[PDB]
Write a protein that binds this DNA or RNA. Sequence first.
DNA 1: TTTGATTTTCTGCTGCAGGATGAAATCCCG
DNA 2: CGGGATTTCATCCTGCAGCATCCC
RNA 3: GGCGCGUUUAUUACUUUGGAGCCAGUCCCAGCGACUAUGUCGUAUGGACGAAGCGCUUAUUUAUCGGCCGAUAAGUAAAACGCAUCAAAGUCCUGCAGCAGAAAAUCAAA
Length: 915
Amino acid sequence: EKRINKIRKKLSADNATKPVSRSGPMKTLLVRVMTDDLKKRLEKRRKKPEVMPQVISNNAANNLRMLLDDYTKMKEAILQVYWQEFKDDHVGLMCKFAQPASXXXXXXXXXXXXXXXXXXXXXXXXXXXXXXXXXXXXXXXXXXXXXXXXXXXXXXXXXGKFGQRALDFYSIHVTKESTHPVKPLAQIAGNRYASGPVGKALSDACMGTIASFLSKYQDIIIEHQKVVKGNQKRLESLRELAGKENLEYPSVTLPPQPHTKEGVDAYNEVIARVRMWVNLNLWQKLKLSRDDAKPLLRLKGFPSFPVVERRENEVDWWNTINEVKKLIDAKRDMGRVFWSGVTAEKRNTILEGYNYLPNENDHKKRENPKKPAKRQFGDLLLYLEKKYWGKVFDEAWERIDKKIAGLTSHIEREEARNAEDAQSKAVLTDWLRAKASFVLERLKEMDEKEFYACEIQLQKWYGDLRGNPFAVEAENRVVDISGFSIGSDGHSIQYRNLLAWKYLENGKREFYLLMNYGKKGRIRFTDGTDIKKSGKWQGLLYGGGKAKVIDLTFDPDDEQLIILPLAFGTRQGREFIWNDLLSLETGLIKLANGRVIEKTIYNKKIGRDEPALFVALTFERREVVDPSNIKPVNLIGVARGENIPAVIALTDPEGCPLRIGEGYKEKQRAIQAAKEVEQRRAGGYSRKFASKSRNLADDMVRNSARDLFYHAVTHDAVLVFANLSRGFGRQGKRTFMTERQYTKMEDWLTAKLAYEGLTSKTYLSKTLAQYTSKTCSNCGXXXXXXXXXXXXXXXXXXXXXXXXXXXXXXXXXXXXXXXXXXXXXXXXXXXXXXXXXXXXXXXXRFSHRPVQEQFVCLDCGHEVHAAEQAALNIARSWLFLNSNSTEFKSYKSGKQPFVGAWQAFYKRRLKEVWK
DNA sequence: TTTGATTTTCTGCTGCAGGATGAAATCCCG
DNA sequence: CGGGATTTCATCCTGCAGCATCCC
RNA sequence: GGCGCGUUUAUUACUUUGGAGCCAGUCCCAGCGACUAUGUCGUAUGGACGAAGCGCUUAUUUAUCGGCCGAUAAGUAAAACGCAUCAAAGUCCUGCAGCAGAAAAUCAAA
């Protein structure tokens, strides 16, 4: 009773079905074409299939490769010419891609004391359902709907929604008029593609991508206006130099609002320089806290133009290895007159301070631990100092150029046969940087001028040599199918695709995807009704509005007609190709859009080099259950977390009364431990588990979304989440992005409660998360006041004591927090409260949640898991928001704040109905 | 011993923003 | 004189929302 | 960690997550550690090598044995069958940015 396809047949077999209004919910397949090895994987099983299915017919793959290459070159040439358009008129391109308005009418005016920005912003009140007053400016009414007052009512210069088809792409480049000199069908593709589906699909993809860039760039210009004003306010550190009278000036003038992309890098170099000076002279040398000398903020988030402005720094490996070796052997003989030179102490000071001698690597972890291959050279230098400082440098050079020529004769014999050693590259680069930072120390003590150019050259070469043998080439190539629809003529396929299903021998189909992108016909059709056991070839082409099947006559030929067979499981077919409830060839599910994706899948025998051809048809629903369900006895309190996500508590609607996804953080920390082991040695990633973390995350998210939906439907529930303000995370030092999934569970539960009919108003509500998961279920803290005294506090009611066990190690330490209080209190108490912060010990012991699993109240004396008690309050906070009793009227009229109103609601209900 | 602040090279995962194109109207060519 | 390939065109949503929640 | 069977997820073979089965050794090159230090000995850290179900049939091959066969321990070669071995999930694309991981430099701090 646990499956997700039993709950949907419980939902859609209880209440009625309504057609959708304007659009529907969208799903999609992700199937794979039978390339070749999907036929090898069938003649290796025990039980062999009866009919060997089909493959790509060896000339469909050639045409598909030609189409994908020509499509990617066309899309790149269009984004090139619009990049050269965008680099001249930012506001010109922004005003070009604005939108049409719609088909409105005669609106008002507002030219009186209001224009636009950088041209006569009128006004109207269209949507009279609830919220009206959309601006809708003009000059083709560019819907300039914006402004949030704050400083001044500044409506946006271009629109609020950039659009896809605002440009009318197909009167420019593609058509045979329009002397704009870059026509991608007549120049690059070679005039052999139809100007029907290719031009419109290329319009779809290129205008979608440039509208994405512009609609991000507008918001980023506004946010940098705020951040540049805030950065100009934080040049009160120019006061802090005379506030301490010991620092002269940082001497850096901030450029204005940058607008381009290189202005951002210049302004960020200036903010980086002032931030480096602030950390060097005001957080360490004078020991100020961070909120006394606030740092300058960096301009983050500037979007670049999509495909034209990638990085492309690709270099070979062996040329940079020989370059590093040339730079090292150029400075050898001047590197002898320094190390056989200066003193007996300055050589020891350079060895000691610049991290050469082994500081503490002697802790045998049940052999000594490994060294970072700069201190191996320190051990060798110490031993060759002991047994043997003039002739030591020659004696410690020959045992490195035998460890470099020993490694470089191990790569070059194990790279140029078949394999990649993948660790003996990283140890060669580590040893070359150690020998580099050993030769160059004549420069970093004698004259520091040409050191930093040589140091930035060695840093660029080390970066190339460490990362570049692990970069991925071969980005994904894709070609759009923009719909299946019979045109205005009676029998002609617009957009030139189908979904074939050639009939097989017994009764079954084979589900091909015919593309016909050549500049001819070769696919035509009349109609069909019989199931004759051969190539009936039926088709599904949406004649007009209603769906239809046809019968289709064509010969598989070597001039067009890319015929891809599909290979999907029985589960994808049972869901949405031949489903019993929403049947195709009737109209309840319509197809909308297809692709052909050639992306990289990891093959088990070799590395990741295996491009396979996915298809990904996108399906829209058109039958949807109507809401006549209320779910009374409901109040399921989902209360999300990170150590154990989505802990559940169920309760009756008066208030009176599971650990879904139990072991998840341990698996993710083990996968990150495996990546951090294969990153310390062997500098890259070993790209097998470069897609393990997202796959495990999606498996847990969709399994727990199934479990929440099952517990919502069967126990007749209304899921009450907590308003975690989408995009919530720890965002600290050791948070990997996979463990940041409080938004994705709500997203998947909504996107499975949008499909199968409902909305986010009948099985998914949301309460406030303010002061939940902090109040005990028999008590009511917020303000830990140590105003009362250092022998005791008074807590809520009654009193308390002291005598503690305060644990705040950050090494291996603790206290007792009575002796600590006395030592930081002496015999004055109040003066110690004014000077020192003794509240840290109070909030280290007397705080709730001592270990980050449990929970102890301060007036109850209670102990519950703080997740099965974070859930019985989320369900009791939604029953406080929308239940107008007495104490929701208060905090709404403004008598009491939220904490006092909620505790006066709780301690009124916790004795009456245990709510 | 370990962490502040800049910087060089790679990677993955989430979080936004475009989307999920049919109907009609010309026009050329056998 | 129709068949079939090009070439234009154009759509729509309101909804209200308050200072912790995650974890260290 | 590696290698394979594969069942349930109410016409097919995809992408995955779980449970169960079988192997995890050799200093050949390297890494790393100790030193009796331009190398010797250890350590399986990476490459390269080999290890990777069982059982019932049938054609064989080695050896025992009952007077040209036939039963046996073991291997080869072939197809079907049973067991170990059982449950779940899928909404994509393009484009950026943001975080986080990783070393490696430079200036400093406790």
